[PDB]
Design an enzyme around this catalytic site. Structure first.
Site, mmCIF file in Angstrom:
data_model
loop_
_atom_site.group_PDB
_atom_site.id
_atom_site.type_symbol
_atom_site.label_atom_id
_atom_site.label_comp_id
_atom_site.label_asym_id
_atom_site.label_seq_id
_atom_site.Cartn_x
_atom_site.Cartn_y
_atom_site.Cartn_z
ATOM 1 N N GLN A 1 -13.692 38.414 10.620
ATOM 2 C CA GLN A 1 -14.317 38.694 9.328
ATOM 3 C C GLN A 1 -15.104 39.977 9.381
ATOM 4 O OE1 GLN A 1 -13.950 37.321 6.095
ATOM 5 N NE2 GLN A 1 -12.373 36.309 7.317
ATOM 6 N N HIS B 1 0.781 -1.236 0.000
ATOM 7 C CA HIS B 1 0.000 0.000 0.000
ATOM 8 C C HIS B 1 0.819 1.295 0.000
ATOM 9 C CE1 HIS B 1 0.677 0.527 4.395
ATOM 10 N NE2 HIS B 1 0.325 1.778 4.156
ATOM 11 N N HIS C 1 0.343 5.106 1.580
ATOM 12 C CA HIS C 1 -0.493 5.980 2.377
ATOM 13 C C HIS C 1 0.048 7.381 2.418
ATOM 14 C CE1 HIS C 1 -1.834 7.546 6.533
ATOM 15 N NE2 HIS C 1 -2.657 7.981 5.596
ATOM 16 N N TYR D 1 -12.791 33.053 13.523
ATOM 17 C CA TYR D 1 -12.941 33.318 12.106
ATOM 18 C C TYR D 1 -14.047 34.333 11.896
ATOM 19 C CZ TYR D 1 -14.335 33.027 7.286
ATOM 20 O OH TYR D 1 -14.637 33.364 5.994
#
Lengths: 130, 130
Positions: free
Chosen positions: B128, B60, B62, B124
């Site tokens: 703003q 695999h 990843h 946030y």
């Protein structure tokens, strides 16, 4: 958590979207607050997304969603925002006029989520080899 | 975690991609495994994504990348896999032969990573406004 999967892909894409209205706090409230919750809930399903959480507040929207892998987070943000704007304002002509058109700002916040176990990785593999 | 910013979006998009080769017989190893670990890094910088972890075991890949909001998980997943196939085959013609241009199966596993706390969200909203 729990994984969707087309034969395409075994996936789990969880995004937190978060954004604010263009003019402070005379907006997301009452019937307006609820229609907003209605429309996004169904935009979510129009695309094939799932609403995992959705809180509307007068200062912000926070929409937590699971979404098909074909969608870019940017596309998703502009989609929810774009089409909610059109819906709300055609359902609340009042708003359209005093928000001068601009219900949102041209900014958004997006954050991925999930904490991926090294066990399910193994699962995917083995149930791939088979 | 670490949140980036363009003009009109604040973002964090950590995805874990996992995919496999068709064959097994020490196909991803030593000579290869070194280039694999190196082309994906390349392709990541080609896209603006920045690698957070990458492991290549014979069974695999990843890759764990943090990416710009403009890329859809699919577009990335096919991009790393598809673009890496194309190179690895080139500088390992011996394997191109003992495979017939078939480096990966056409499935993949994507999964989002990251939390969001309330503090993050308020911050946030709160920046703003100005």
């Amino acid at each position: 958590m729990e994984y969707k999967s087309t034969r395409h892909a075994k996936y789990l894409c969880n995004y937190h979207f978060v954004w604010i209205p263009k003019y402070r706090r005379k907006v997301l409230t009452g019937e307006v607050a609820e229609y907003t919750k209605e429309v996004l809930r169904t935009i979510a399903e129009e695309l094939g997304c799932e609403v995992l959480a959705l809180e509307v507040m007068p200062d912000h929207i926070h929409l937590f969603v699971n979404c098909p892998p074909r969608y870019a987070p940017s596309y998703l943000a502009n989609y929810f925002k774009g089409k909610s704007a059109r819906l709300i304002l055609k359902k609340f002509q009042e708003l359209k006029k005093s928000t001068n058109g601009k219900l949102w700002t041209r900014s958004y916040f997006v954050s991925t989520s999930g904490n991926v176990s090294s066990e399910t990785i193994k699962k995917y593999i083995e149930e791939q080899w088979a």
